[PDB]
Design a binder for this molecule. Structure first.
Ligand SMILES: COc1ccc2nc(C)c(O[C@@H]3C[C@H]4C(=O)N[C@]5(C(=O)NS(=O)(=O)C6(C)CC6)C[C@H]5/C=C\CCCCC[C@H](NC(=O)O[C@H](C5CCCC5)C(F)(F)F)C(=O)N4C3)nc2c1
Ligand SMILES: [Zn+2]
Length: 193
């Protein structure tokens, strides 16, 4: 057998004054699209909700590349209107993969602000303040159970101006409580590019 494609199943809408998740495809259509690799749904926005047959997570467009984590996507293609699209970037050492950004998506601009006051966008459209603590680390201003972050890998960390600062990769927790986050800095994306 052959593994299916990653499938865009929704998005995190950041266009207005309120952030909210939108679903664009149900479970049945997702499984069919994963097998065929043919997705004719219109794509919009910067942060996509994506799914395989077994996992769901996020993917974020930055600089014309739709980025996500290797531990979610593996080496899978992504479904597109013309069929499955092969990864343009794969780096298991960074837990990073990327495809060409879908037609209709909007790309975040890489941050050049040098700010340490960040915001993590989750699959439930929570915008979580995060204080940057290193090249790949930031602390939650309000810790919370890791349950609330599960499924948000591939989502963005944003600066106050809405630039992309990094891609959410892993949670740092003590007794099931997430106190910090580990992320792929945008500079690591820009180098890979
Ligand atoms: C296979 O080839 C590769 C190559 C390179 C890889 N590189 C990494 C770092 C990795 O980590 C795995 C997956 C990741 C995760 O679970 N990611 C988020 C997520 O949501 N995924 S997901 O969408 O639900 C889904 C699984 C569907 C895709 C955001 C997490 C949300 C909640 C945490 C849940 C408990 C888990 C806490 C754990 N914590 C942690 O590992 O901490 C760090 C240690 C780090 C590595 C060392 C450190 F340093 F940060 F402390 C944690 O976060 N993960 C465990 N797998 C790799 C695998
Ligand atoms: Zn910025």
């Amino acid at each position: 057998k052959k593994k299916g494609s990653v499938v865009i199943v929704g998005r995190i809408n950041l266009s207005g004054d309120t952030a909210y998740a939108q679903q664009t495809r149900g479970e049945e259509g997702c499984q069919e699209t994963s097998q065929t690799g043919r997705d004719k749904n219109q794509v919009e926005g910067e942060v996509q909700i994506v799914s395989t047959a077994t996992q769901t997570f996020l993917a974020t467009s930055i600089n014309g590349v739709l980025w996500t984590v290797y531990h979610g996507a593996g080496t899978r293609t992504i479904a597109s209107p013309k069929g499955p699209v092969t990864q343009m970037y794969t780096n298991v050492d960074k837990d990073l993969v990327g495809w060409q950004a879908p037609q209709g998506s909007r790309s975040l601009t890489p941050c050049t602000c040098g700010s340490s006051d960040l915001y993590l966008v989750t699959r439930h459209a929570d915008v979580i303040p995060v204080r940057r603590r290193g090249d790949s680390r930031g602390s939650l201003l309000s810790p919370r159970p890791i349950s609330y972050l599960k499924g948000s890998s591939g989502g963005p960390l944003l600066c106050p101006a809405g630039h992309a600062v990094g891609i959410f990769r892993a949670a740092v927790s003590t007794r099931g409580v997430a106190k910090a986050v580990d992320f792929i800095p945008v500079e690591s994306l820009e180098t890979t590019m």
